[PDB]
Amino acid sequence: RIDSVSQLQNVAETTKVLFDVSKETVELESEAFELKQKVELAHEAKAVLDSW
């Protein structure tokens, strides 16, 4: 029974860490969207400029 209990003890603290970490990561991707629109604008501009 002690063996069963021990696995769960270590989990209880560390899982709270991942829970936070995952949501923290999701925030970073929001900011990545801002980059994506920047990437697009440049590409379009370069293409027209190439045509010119």
Partner: protein, 171 residues
């Protein structure tokens, strides 16, 4: 680093291995890894916002459109504005998660010490080098309850006496 996040993630996938009834928690974590890996390649793919006008305007001799798209690019320069949308959902999520996390932690820690104590109780007191049915009747009235139920049942064969404890018999 990013490696801290990811190390804790994959360690937790393998911790999630050691817990069942959490068969899609790791799949959410995998998705978080995916999009984390996506944003770095998104960022590496990048075309810098500005037009080239050092070389690539002095290349064009028809230039009256490079000033146009330069000014259009610099006009729409906050192409997409800032977002932090994880600040209401992250805190709410953190409250439910924290509550549950601490509850689990306290529960299993409590059980560990309870079991430690019980293990000690079996070791330092245990009638087994002298055992009378009076001692088992005294520590468990379950003994007498079962005995009475068997007398009431009118069956004097009980498997439990011959199922590991002996049963030598003349016949």
């Amino acid at each position: 680093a990013k490696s801290a996040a990811n190390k804790l993630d994959w360690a937790k996938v393998i911790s999630s291995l050691r817990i069942t009834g959490s068969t899609a928690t790791q799949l959410s974590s995998f998705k978080k890894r995916n999009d984390e890996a996506r944003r770095q390649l998104l960022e590496l793919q990048s075309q810098p916002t500005e037009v080239d006008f050092s070389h690539y305007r002095s290349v064009l001799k028809n230039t009256s459109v490079i000033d146009k798209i330069e000014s259009y690019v610099k006009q729409y320069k906050p192409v997409k504005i800032d977002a932090s949308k994880q600040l209401q959902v992250i805190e709410s999520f953190e409250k439910h998660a924290m509550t549950n996390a601490k509850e689990t932690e306290s529960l299993v820690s409590k059980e560990l010490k309870d079991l430690q104590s019980t293990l000690d109780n079996i070791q330092s007191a245990r009638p087994f080098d002298e055992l009378t049915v009076d001692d088992l009747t005294k520590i468990k009235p379950e003994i007498d309850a079962k005995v009475e139920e068997m007398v009431k049942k009118g069956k004097w064969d009980v498997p439990g006496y011959k199922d590991r404890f002996g049963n030598l018999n003349v016949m």
